[PDB]
Enzyme design. Sequence first.
Site, PDB file in Angstrom:
ATOM      1  N   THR A 168       0.842  -1.227   0.000  1.00 35.33           N
ATOM      2  CA  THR A 168       0.000   0.000   0.000  1.00 35.33           C
ATOM      3  C   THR A 168       0.860   1.252   0.000  1.00 35.33           C
ATOM      4  O   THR A 168       1.915   1.291   0.627  1.00 35.33           O
ATOM      5  CB  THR A 168      -0.934   0.041   1.219  1.00 35.33           C
ATOM      6  N   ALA A 203      -7.288  -3.344   5.953  1.00 38.69           N
ATOM      7  CA  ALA A 203      -8.464  -2.735   5.343  1.00 38.69           C
ATOM      8  C   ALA A 203      -9.682  -2.828   6.249  1.00 38.69           C
ATOM      9  O   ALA A 203     -10.472  -1.882   6.322  1.00 38.69           O
ATOM     10  CB  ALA A 203      -8.762  -3.392   3.996  1.00 38.69           C
TER      11      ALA A 203
END
Lengths: 195, 195, 196, 221, 203, 220, 81, 81, 230, 212, 212
Positions: free
Chosen positions: J1, J49
């Site tokens: 990420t 997430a």
Amino acid sequence: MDIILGIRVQDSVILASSKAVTRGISVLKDSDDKTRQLSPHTLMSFAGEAGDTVQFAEYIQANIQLYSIREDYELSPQAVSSFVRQELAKSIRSRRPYQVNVLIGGYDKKKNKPELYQIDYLGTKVELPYGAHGYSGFYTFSLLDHHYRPDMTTEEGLDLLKLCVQELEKRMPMDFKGVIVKIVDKDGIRQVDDF
Amino acid sequence: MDIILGIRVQDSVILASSKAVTRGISVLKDSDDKTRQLSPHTLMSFAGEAGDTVQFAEYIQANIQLYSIREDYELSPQAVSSFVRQELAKSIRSRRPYQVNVLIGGYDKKKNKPELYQIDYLGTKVELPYGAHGYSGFYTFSLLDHHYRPDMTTEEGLDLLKLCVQELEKRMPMDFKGVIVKIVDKDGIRQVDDF
Amino acid sequence: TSIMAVTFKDGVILGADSRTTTGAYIANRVTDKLTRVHDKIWCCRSGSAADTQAIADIVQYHLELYTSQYGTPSTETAASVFKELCYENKDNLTAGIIVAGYDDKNKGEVYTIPLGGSVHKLPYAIAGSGSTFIYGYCDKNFRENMSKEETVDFIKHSLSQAIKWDGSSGGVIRMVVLTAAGVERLIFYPDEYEQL
Amino acid sequence: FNPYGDNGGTILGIAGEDFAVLAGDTRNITDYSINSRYEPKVFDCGDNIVMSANGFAADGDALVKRFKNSVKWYHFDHNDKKLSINSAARNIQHLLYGKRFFPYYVHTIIAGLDEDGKGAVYSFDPVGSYEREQCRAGGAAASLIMPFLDNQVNFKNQYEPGTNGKVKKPLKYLSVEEVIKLVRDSFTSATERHIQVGDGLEILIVTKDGVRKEFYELKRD
Amino acid sequence: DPSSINGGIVVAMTGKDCVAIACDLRLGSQSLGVSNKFEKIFHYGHVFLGITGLATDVTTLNEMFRYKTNLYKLKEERAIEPETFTQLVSSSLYERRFGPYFVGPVVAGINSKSGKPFIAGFDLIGCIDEAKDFIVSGTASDQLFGMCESLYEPNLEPEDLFETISQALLNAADRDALSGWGAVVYIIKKDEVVKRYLKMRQD
Amino acid sequence: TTIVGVKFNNGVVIAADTRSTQGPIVADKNCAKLHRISPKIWCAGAGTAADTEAVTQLIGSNIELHSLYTSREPRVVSALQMLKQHLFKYQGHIGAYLIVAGVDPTGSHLFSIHAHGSTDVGYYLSLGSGSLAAMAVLESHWKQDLTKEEAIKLASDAIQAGIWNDLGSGSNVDVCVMEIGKDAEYLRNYLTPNVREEKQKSYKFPRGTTAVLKESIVNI
Amino acid sequence: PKFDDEYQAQARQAPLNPYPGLTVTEPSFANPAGGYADGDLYPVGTSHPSQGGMIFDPAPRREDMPPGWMPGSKYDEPFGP
Amino acid sequence: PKFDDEYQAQARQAPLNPYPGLTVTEPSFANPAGGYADGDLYPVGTSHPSQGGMIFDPAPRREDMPPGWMPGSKYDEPFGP
Amino acid sequence: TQQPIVTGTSVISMKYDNGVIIAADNLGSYGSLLRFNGVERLIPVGDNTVVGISGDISDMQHIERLLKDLVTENAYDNPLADAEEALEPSYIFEYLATVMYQRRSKMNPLWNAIIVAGVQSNGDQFLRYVNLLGVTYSSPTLATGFGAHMANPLLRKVVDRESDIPKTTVQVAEEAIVNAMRVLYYRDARSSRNFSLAIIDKNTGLTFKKNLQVENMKWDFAKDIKGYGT
Amino acid sequence: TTTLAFRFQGGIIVAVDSRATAGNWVASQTVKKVIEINPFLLGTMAGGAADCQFWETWLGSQCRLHELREKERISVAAASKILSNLVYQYKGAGLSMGTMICGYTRKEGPTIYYVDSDGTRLKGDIFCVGSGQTFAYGVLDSNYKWDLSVEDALYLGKRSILAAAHRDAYSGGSVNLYHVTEDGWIYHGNHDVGELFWKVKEEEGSFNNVIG
Amino acid sequence: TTTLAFRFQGGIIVAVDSRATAGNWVASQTVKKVIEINPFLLGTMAGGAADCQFWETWLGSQCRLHELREKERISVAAASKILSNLVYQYKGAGLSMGTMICGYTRKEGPTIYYVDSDGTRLKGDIFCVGSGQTFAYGVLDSNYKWDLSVEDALYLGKRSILAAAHRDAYSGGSVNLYHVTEDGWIYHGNHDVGELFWKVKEEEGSFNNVIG
């Protein structure tokens, strides 16, 4: 921990290495040169465990000098890098692995081309236009990808190296006490006083 | 890992703390202030784990302010340090200890005497003329022992602090990105732009 | 496993069960655990199968060479070879063995070599995971100089109880009767020894 | 005591224009043994929604029962109103994260038509983190199934011939029949190369006309 | 994990009378991508050997097989055939049974005498995986197996063989974190070899 | 993997499936698992596959050398002894489990060998992840003095049980029949009960679908 | 009372090197023991001062797999469950 | 075959905290082992990348001591050998 | 139950054209010691239901008490309890599965594998499995422990799919069950010669053949083995 | 990420990739890594997430309660403090969070607070989060200026995410850009790295090492 | 342990404490921590007493063989290289060594080589070794000058060891001083910390926090 950087320029290879030597809680020296001249136009810089770095560097230098003496010509940077890789890869499965990462920057006087090879402690050789070992690559690679060109002169390469080194100074937690920069080119090896 | 230094002098208490904030491989910020004003003449500097430092600092500040408002007078630095020690010691046997070391430098307006208290994360309080936490004491204590005098004015204290900080820069492996220096004295708390 | 050897008036009767297991699975239910190391010397394998079979082959080699060079060995020579092989490799090996044989000068003899690698002559010996359940029965029912039929029935009852109580023991009860007359294979099926 | 298993189920949700497809194998597994040839794991949930809490079978059953309870209570409170796909997604997210520190080891998928009448697929992790997806495989053979559907459904890495890689193949709508062809072929490949798949393929079709069930045989070896 | 540390992909397929072997070009250390020129396909005469796994072992085996195949060529006066090369690789891999190279090789070629396409795969320690349709190795072994199974069908001519293998590698690599930065596809025939570099995602 | 050996009235028949799997993936759908140690000695192995291959290769080479040396047909017990001694020497680190069956002047023999060097005589044997399912059929249907046809049918059906009921076993059935008086009969893919399902569409791509950066001709 | 395992079929293999042959991962080399006087040699006594992304997915341990198992090699369970 | 200790007098005790009460030395607190997606937060994958003196010379571990034992407390073996 | 101590090995069952057959041996083993031989592991809960249980024997007895209490509580204020609104196999199985899952979630599992077999009041056969983890599934044939590997293939040879159930008669299913139990006795070290068998038929109700014997054992071939190798 | 957020004369630029990975298997490539707390407040997630999505939706609910009660916007400082306290109270429970709370308030101006699992909360002008944060820093720190034009700031964010996507295995997908303005935040669309990379290579001439 | 050696205009000053400890128990307070290799070469042992003492005594015999064979003294570089190679070949075997090889040679001048267990070999002008090295550095780096007088250099070494002895529990005892001159090494005696401390406090006025 060590910083060792390399940029292959149109004419020359620019190798930079950190000057600090840290042992535990204290920095012992702030002017250490983490490089050995394998040959008049071949230069090697190393990073890794304290004794292993210098012991492997001197072993490799002695072997390369023995080969050059025996055959009466300078080994090509490709041959030198292959020998170093073979020694590193041959060690990881031995009793005493060398935890040493090396960047070999040389000028192939026969091909008349600068050459930079990155070799990790496992023995993974790869020819690169710009190379970095350990965490030093995590900051510099994106900047090098952005600004690097094949046709740079050594001065633009030094400017790019300044960008990389000051980025490392900014974002990276350790104090590596600056770098020592050496250029490998047609005329041999020299050191830059303040790049 | 954080530098926090404190030197009690004739008139004032000089607290210094590193500016760098690091998370893993990267320095997120390099202008951080590791101090909180517990009272107009009492200042606290803290070092330790990321969330614990700031959470404990703000909890202590809120409690000290609540006590000051309820009793309608400023708590002495001794009382503030005792409360902080009580919280820290009560924490280590709870579910969530605060891994926070603190130096409380205050000026007791009732005694008209500066006070410096060193409190480790276990709750070990001790009043000192000069204090340091973690590895920061290993380099600086000998120099402070050599040069310290009870009768220094604040300017000589700042000179001694410069000596300590540059010794840290020399022999310390980390790049703590300089320090923020705040002086606590009869007139209140102020910062030194370039000590 | 339930191994057993019992000396009797005319010789020695060697007996065993036929079940071999790998955990709860019966990997082989008709295996033969009695091994002919020499003409009148038979050993029983207990513990690791690989170790016991390697030891048995080495002992057969050594005893064949002994027979060719020095004449027929006794039961004691065979068990001594077993002892040396087991002891000199006791850390690697995990084999306990019973050695039974018949020699005319000594008649029937039984030696047991527990997991530690020591040698013991006994009038009778029981080995294997199922022996633990028949120590009391064998102790209270064994007698010196039993007849052949008495010894056969005694071994049958003992191994029947061992098979009843041990999940690792089962199958047919096999015995080998060593006597001056010769060696006799005997086999008794579950419906025969379980209805005792 | 290890409280989790792995029953090796596989599920696949694909969303079209006016339809949504949720397909999943009927094989049930424990280690290398076949528990049952026909254990459906894609369920017609009513309200024009289809769900499959694939993964560890006990947690799948528990989560499905909890969601049925929650939707029934929603019907009770909201005078038997139809539950929307997004509302169901939020409900199941709150169910999954309610056990944040002892998660349901299930990879849930719900498929249906959204408030605009367009197909929608919501795919979940054991903790939550819902993403609305055009297509999403799950389970043991998700890795085998999914790249092929990226290639066929989205035409990724496909370029118009003669343009030398400058013009991509445009994304046309796949009819429900064509999506069924793709699902069957993908599950056939997964059956061929994955040992935990090949007993039977069940497909639920969600469209404006309602939920429709189809069943197809697989290799079963 | 030595096999997962450097990533990389290799896939081989058999056409009607031609073979194709393809690999990605990424070299890295888990997260960090280092080089985009680490070609894992090596050739020794007319037989091609792709090697995934620990890059040091990839290079070491490239050197070892260069040496052994050159000696074979010299003292046999003929190039090593795909079957003989497969046996040589299997024997060399098992030689270090207890100290094995952490690689998965993949042999591909056309036997010069019979002219029959040949491909084979291996594990760490030389288990021959001779297969008639296609071979897969690398970090994306699962993706590639599924993709090739879906796409491959028998008797593909060289152009359609190229398209099938390139699409399989591209779509498999796009779903593998440790694979990519371009790929190279070799189309090998009885009389020529065509090397092509594929355009793909650079992330 | 699923192997079975079955001795019958005049020989022994060894059978195996063909699915080969790495992890949960089917690496090869038609792997040949029956290996010649000699013309009339055949083996099939489980455990570490590479070790089974290397050990069977070693024993076959040594046995052919010994047969040439002694000018005699190999004995099955010779292979058993050599294999078990070699496996024992490494204390099970070779991890090769085998069912070895064959015919020799002494009769028809069926053995099993384990990684640590232990061996067993048997009349019917099974091995591999499908061992239990195949052994169920063997126990249910085996009898003394099976005919060759009944033996083949029984071995094939035990392998089929392993195929249908075990995940790590599938595809086709390989059978090899050794009989006392005549040569062994290797039956590659004796049964093919798992023919491939047909594609719903041909997924061939029009030429030019892929984007190519460079093209070159290689000087091999 | 344990069951007999005569063949050692269920027999399972200092901590084990996760990847045999590689000394760089050897426990005695990855984590070497300190010197007996390292406390006197360095001030604080010490010579020195993951996988899975956003998605929660849910290898074997060489210390409970059988001796013949090579990490990453093709292995078929010999006896089944 | 074990020796059937009826009184549990030979009874001996996550790894035990060497210093009970102090949570700063609890293994679960000294080594919390991060979180499921730490590899995605931090580039390295990790958020964080002796008493022996000069002269060599030849306390117990709670795990090897009876449950009633407190490190540093006066203890008398109930039976000794 | 962190670990099982005294255990019953396996239960095997299958459904046939008009009902279901379930069988289990009467042996509870303390490790490798075949300690208790008179254990009953088939638990009738009515004329239409039989619950077969494996695993820890103490947890089995606890589950049996739970089933008795289920019946007793069903009888309360239920004047129709004897003919309709009686406990169907499905209700018993759902209660047991809920209890098993709750125990698992509380980290205190009941270390049992339970097969609930019976016929619904409409005549449809019920046959479902549930284990300590709460994992449940249905199949024409079910088995537990070594039955899931040794016995289940033999039963599946008789009814490999739902289409085969109407083709299977009482005699065929019972012979298949007896042959499977014989095979389990052959190959399962935890098994016993004595076993109980229960038949639930939609027409003739529950038949419960207790303490049956494994018969027609084949051992006479063992005489022809004389050692390992030579 | 990879996620970044930097203040400049025109507001805040927030850029994020889209890849989500489970092990080496790329689970998806279109994950929305920015959560829209309110029309003037923006949450940027990295790491876990599930934790980020759930707890920032909860943060949005708390923000809603705040407007309902107090008739004024929750300040960025207040929202980041609530999130920091929450994440800290679960410290050691396994939460995986890295968050940059970007927003604009009349009394605050443009403001960024970096918040993560360990309870850290940092006010700052430039932040990068995720496995690829170092590469984004390498690009940002060498090009960032306070007085960048809006187009130049957007391009700088796009390029900084592109560099990390190139060099980081876990940071590919597509680049989503947000511009937090005085009157709200503007979504400047989604850019696919598979096309952005080649466009940037041709326009800048950078990535000279990349074949083609 | 605390040991220091620094080059200066007059040669080299080598200072070491005397305390040796085994846990909390102070084994002895009169340990000689300088091994006298030859009249121009000087070893400075730290860490493990046995390893340093034995291996530097052996280095003495190697030096003797060197003069006997080659009729010229072993260079400081050569002796330090021999020791470094030896210690390296036992890396991982448990050696505990920290050694400064101080010497003087006509073709080298005054030279100091730091050698330790992990195989490192550093040429340098100032070194401090042992548990108290940081405290000695704090004084040396703040007071060291190249052109110090011999008396001032001796006092600086004495004071630097005194600081570490005060602040470090494992660095007390007595201070032994050596001066490596152009014509050899001069042993400037032993100073007991229990008296040196009070003398230094009185003369300097430092240690103002210490009661007395």
